[PDB]
Design a protein around this nucleic acid. Structure first.
Lengths: 195, 113
RNA sequence: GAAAGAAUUAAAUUAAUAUAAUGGUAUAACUGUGCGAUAAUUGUAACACAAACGAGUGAAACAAGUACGUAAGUAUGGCAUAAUGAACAAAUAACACUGAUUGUAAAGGUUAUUGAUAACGAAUAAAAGUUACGCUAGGGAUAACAGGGUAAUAUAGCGAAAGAGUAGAUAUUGUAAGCUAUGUUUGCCACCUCGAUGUCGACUCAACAUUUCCUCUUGGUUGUAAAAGCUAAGAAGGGUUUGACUGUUCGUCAAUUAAAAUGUUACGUGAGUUGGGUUAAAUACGAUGUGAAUCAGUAUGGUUCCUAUCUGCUGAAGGAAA
RNA sequence: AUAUAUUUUAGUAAUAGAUAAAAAUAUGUACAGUAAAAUUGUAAGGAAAACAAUAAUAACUUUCUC
RNA sequence: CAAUCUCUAAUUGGUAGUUUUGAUGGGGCGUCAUUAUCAGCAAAAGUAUCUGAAUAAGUCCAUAAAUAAAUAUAUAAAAUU
RNA sequence: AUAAUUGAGGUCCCGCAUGAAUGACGUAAUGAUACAACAACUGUCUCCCCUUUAAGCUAAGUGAAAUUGAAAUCGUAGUGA
RNA sequence: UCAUCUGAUUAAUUGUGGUUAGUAGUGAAAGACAAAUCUGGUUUGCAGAUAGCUGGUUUUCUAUGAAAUAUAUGUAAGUAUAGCCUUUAUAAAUAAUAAUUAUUAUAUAAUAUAUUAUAUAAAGAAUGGUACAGCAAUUAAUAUAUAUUAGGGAACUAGUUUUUUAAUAAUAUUAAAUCUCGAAAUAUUUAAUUAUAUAUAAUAAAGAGUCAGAUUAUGUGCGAUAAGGUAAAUAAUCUAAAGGGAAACAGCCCAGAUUAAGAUAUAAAGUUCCUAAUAAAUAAUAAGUGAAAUAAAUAUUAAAAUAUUAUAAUAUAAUCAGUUCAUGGGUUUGACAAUAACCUAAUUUUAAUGAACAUGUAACAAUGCACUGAUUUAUACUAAAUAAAAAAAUAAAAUAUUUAAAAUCAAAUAUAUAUAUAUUUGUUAAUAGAUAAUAUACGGAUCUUAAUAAUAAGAAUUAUUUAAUUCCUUGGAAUAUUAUAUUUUAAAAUAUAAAUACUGAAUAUCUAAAUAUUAUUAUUAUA
RNA sequence: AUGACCCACCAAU
RNA sequence: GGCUACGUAGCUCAGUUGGUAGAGCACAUCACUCAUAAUGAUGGGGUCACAGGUUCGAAUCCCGUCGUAGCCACCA
RNA sequence: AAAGAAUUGCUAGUAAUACGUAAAUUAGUAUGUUACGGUGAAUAUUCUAACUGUUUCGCACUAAUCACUCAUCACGCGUUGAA
């Protein structure tokens, strides 16, 4: 509903920033969560405007609405407010009036997701290709068995990466603050703190 | 068009005397806006919560078992000591005076109430 | 077993705090309260922090006195960080320090306080314009134009294909978005000289590109019967206009033509021309300003030079290795 | 009973708590306590009056007591 | 009276001397000029621009809620009666 | 009005922003003023041709000038304040 | 000047002479004129006006050597204080720089559950909130056949209620200049040790210059993630730096000229030619892609791999059994649009008011809602059913996904080591797209190799590498070439070189020269 | 029947 | 396009320097008239165009959007 | 809570009467109609205004002043001028 037009109470101008190249191997929003088939970015990290996203959504919908129990999950919201000073002004007196909303999209991230009752995969693939024709990146069809993109030419299965109880790890190799707290909890300090 | 071209020269506000360092009575161990760092052994805290030197020693940023979730910045009177001082023990103390060995000096100090 | 206390852990700094925002805050700075109402005191301040200086910020301590607290003690204004202003000049103290021959005094010192310099390190006590009559020193160190940089813009192209297209997305059509190209335009930048008019249009003369207007070849074209066409490929050899109005580029319009392409070439072209426009000195008109004057306004008028040295080009000789 | 003097009472007024997040003073000191939000409520009462209730008891001590 | 001298006042582009701020992505008009807070600001400090501020400031807060609170009633004293 | 007219004249009046001695409006006469129309005429033009004279060119005589870092001084692409 | 046009008895034209001008006259009014030109003449004097502006500033040698920042400035073309510079000294002197130690833990070891030593691991005293990461609180976004609230609706018999709504809860999923609960490295900086002392601070007394910077790299604000842009931050160079490279080249890549010289190492970059200097392996490319200035989405053709089906496809008829799918429908039997989408049929043989439907050696089989047009709709008509054809898979079928060393696997390192863990390495190609203006322009030539056949060529492109090659532990061992010798029947066998690539600077060393300084000297004569 | 209509008031010689 | 003043009871115009829920005219209902219309006496209507915010209390106020004459005017 | 502008009846046994009475029409109901009586008045003619008969003067009216009549504007349609 509000993914292409956030309702920040205090509307305000924003700096340009940069699209996060996720050097640490994030895989956040790079996985199929809601649907069966999806459309992910394949190229370098890119900014997608609100209008472009809307058009992609519309393109996808043409295939989704005919389906029985058809659904489209829009995975990303255009949260960054872009201002643009007109291409007609001498220079930076002041800044720029609000123009459009935009989203910073990392390399591996999923944009859309679909799942119908009577949805064959070929149709879904076609729809997602047609959606990609309207967006500024280069995109890729992603199924539930197809594995998570991280880099431009690199891949990963989330099933593989290890599970860890971090409290236990902390206890094993404790910080100074934690040790101080533990000492405080002990009786030769707790009795004589005198509050 | 109104230009928000105004801002304030930032306030130099950080540690000014680091660990193991040798201070002197009355020096600024850490300007800060807030009691981010609380006065600790042998140190004093000023109006702005600035922390200053009370005894000439060695600054030591140390946590404290008694006061948890806090961080102090004291100044042991000597390096050998560890400012997270024990507790149930004598407290290091410094006399700080030179006995007037001069007859005249001693006389003046005494004779004078 | 029960009560009661003392509380302890968790949670919390989202409440609140004199006021922004951040930082801090329950060990509470926050809240209630008693007392009080004093330290919102007075001399020396070390020493740091910050820092060009002038200034500013923390502050041990020594000394005099006050307040609250059994006491430890704490208190030199507020949780912190804004809340301000030099000197000079007067003023009112205060001072007991000078006292111009002496004594007084006048006045001046010293301390205390005072009102603004917000273009807020304050040029004086006190100062707006216009110049197309303009002048000098300069800068091109920051605009004019032309080159460059750039490619939003502009110009063209491509992928995809919603939607037209009788019936069919791809005969022809092609939105919004997408990806490029281009380096023509409107920009943007100030990097060229800013002693580059070639001052923006015409004439003379063209050169070049091809992103082909015609002409030649050729695919498709329920939307090729034929003829007209539409659309696309190759293709730049040749050719691509004369008037009415307008300074005009442009456009409308007439009459034509096979067609009347699109550009580049310092928006091709004056040391080759014109000078109508934009253009200084006169001038008037509407509007603006108290006015001088002004204006993207409209209008009458209005000064351009140069014997070619080099390169280049057009011809023409001489010399010469033949 | 009742009369005169004399007085006394009645000038009718909140806090009774070291009060504690209503409004009142914002500098000092000393002592003490914890807020807000939210939800189940409740004459009028409702989205929005006030008011009530909204974590855990190991251990420790005291008192009674089988 | 009025004229002249002197003083005083009014008035004045008649005229004379003067000044007409700077920042500005050429200039001008606009806008601004001091303080404080965050980001920018890249885990010490510092950090710019006609940068973003839902920005904030040129302060505000005090003479106070007093007084009473131990020797008392008659009467006699003054070893506290 | 012209084949066709952003000009001209007439007229209309949402007079961006006319108006009465900064004079209003309308004529005659005048104007080296300006705009437009007609006729006549033209080498202005279609389209230039021819001719005369003064140069220009060659010989003799006298004999300048602005300019000039030094020059053994081509083309194109690229280059570079 | 000429041609022309105009006044030509008048406000006419002119001669001689005079008057009025430099705060200043004259002006039928133009800033017009006042002696070749005035919004105010000329001369002399003030007077060397004044110039934050412009230009100029003259010999040589030596040693050091900047800045273009901050602050304030009627200040932004200036000037002052600092920042950066120089000279000459000073010492209670190492305070300067750099690095290490500092810590956590494990093993063993020795003492007394202890705490020393050793060794190993760990981004290892202290401070911080960037990247990173994350969704906690805060700021935002998503999704629920959830619930609940009331409702929008809903039969019914207002309730119940049912397919919508909002919020909020529940769960799950995300991002952010001004959020950071996890959280780097760089960094800030501590004491002592250590190495720099022919060296650093620090301090004394003096001189400056600069306060227009530029580019390049990185993280940013602005700008359109435009600019040789603009605003700072950081690093370097330039500025002020000659040299080699990058065709040419302020800033990039190397590297710092004292004077030589030119033997030895080299740097960056290169080694077909131009043009100093080379030979190899192994892939891949065929496009001159390319060869020192990498142009895209997309299409195509390939290539691997992974599935599934594979050794059973083009070739080959038949396209059928509900079916003519159902509805509406002039028209619709495939395709009219809507709508629906799977089911029967298995010969050799049959009636209007009753026997699942049987396992017969097997009903079943999407093997088609004619793929899809066609057509008035059908018919016609292609039509899923699918093959012949297999020394079999080991490998040459289709339908895709894919374009990867994460995972898995292989190769290797590291620890205990008879192979235990951890780290590292290993996964696509070509064409098209292709695109302006003096002239083709990889710098130019030109480069992709071919037996026969020269001593003889065979990238000069791209990818990964070598200095012969393979082994071995830079140094080798082996051997194969390459060479040449030998002495024998062009071969033979033995021998030996030699396998150390090369060019390459004004770098370095070397070899001489100069000056300076510290340290020793030698000689001659504040000794 | 022809046949929808009617409109003004102000203050003295 | 941020950027100055104006958005009222049916109509017009209010009010001003707060101490607020006005005016006629039109309209409805009487009356007057033979019947109108004047005239006369009786009632109607303000969200004083929307958000939020303040002194005890803003039509008023602050604090800016959905609305009214607008903004081009260093050209060689 | 004696009822605004405005308006109605009545001049003598009348008005007024919180004085009653009767009848007709009713199977039946009078705050109405028509009759009866009891008590029983003030105020007055002098102005305007209105309606009438008598008279004056005027009179463009005559279904007669609720007459009649006039010009502009607005509508539609002829003719004839200026240009």
């Amino acid at each position: 509903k509000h993914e292409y037009a956030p309702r920040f109470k205090i509307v305000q101008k924003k700096q340009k920033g940069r699209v996060p190249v996720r050097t640490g191997g994030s895989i956040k929003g790079s996985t199929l969560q809601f649907g069966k088939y999806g459309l992910r970015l394949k190229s370098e990290g890119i900014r997608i405007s609100a209008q472009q996203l809307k058009e992609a959504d519309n393109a996808i919908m043409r295939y989704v609405r005919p389906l029985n129990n058809g659904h489209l999950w829009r995975r990303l919201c255009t949260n960054v407010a872009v201002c643009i000073k007109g291409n007609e002004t001498r220079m930076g007196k002041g800044k720029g009036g609000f123009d459009h909303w935009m989203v910073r999209v990392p390399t591996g991230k999923i944009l859309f997701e679909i799942n119908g009752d009577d949805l064959h995969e070929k149709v879904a693939r076609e729809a997602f290709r047609k959606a990609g024709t309207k967006l500024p990146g280069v995109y890729e069809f992603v199924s539930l068995d197809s594995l998570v993109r991280v880099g431009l030419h690199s891949f990963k299965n989330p099933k593989d990466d290890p599970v860890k109880n971090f409290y236990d790890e902390n206890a094993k190799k404790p910080s100074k603050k934690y040790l101080n707290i533990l000492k405080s909890q002990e009786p030769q300090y707790k009795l004589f703190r005198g509050r | 068009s109104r230009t928000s071209m105004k801002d304030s020269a930032g306030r130099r506000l950080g540690p000014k005397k680091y660990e193991g360092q040798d201070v002197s009575t009355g020096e600024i161990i850490m300007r800060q806006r807030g009691t981010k760092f609380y006065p600790g052994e042998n140190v004093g805290i000023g109006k702005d919560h600035s922390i200053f030197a009370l005894e000439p020693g060695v600054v030591r940023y140390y946590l404290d078992p008694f006061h948890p979730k806090r961080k102090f910045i004291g100044v042991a009177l000597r390096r050998d000591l560890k400012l997270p001082s024990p507790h149930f023990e004598p407290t290091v103390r410094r006399f700080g005076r030179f006995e007037l060995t001069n007859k005249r000096a001693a006389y003046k100090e005494e004779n004078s109430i």
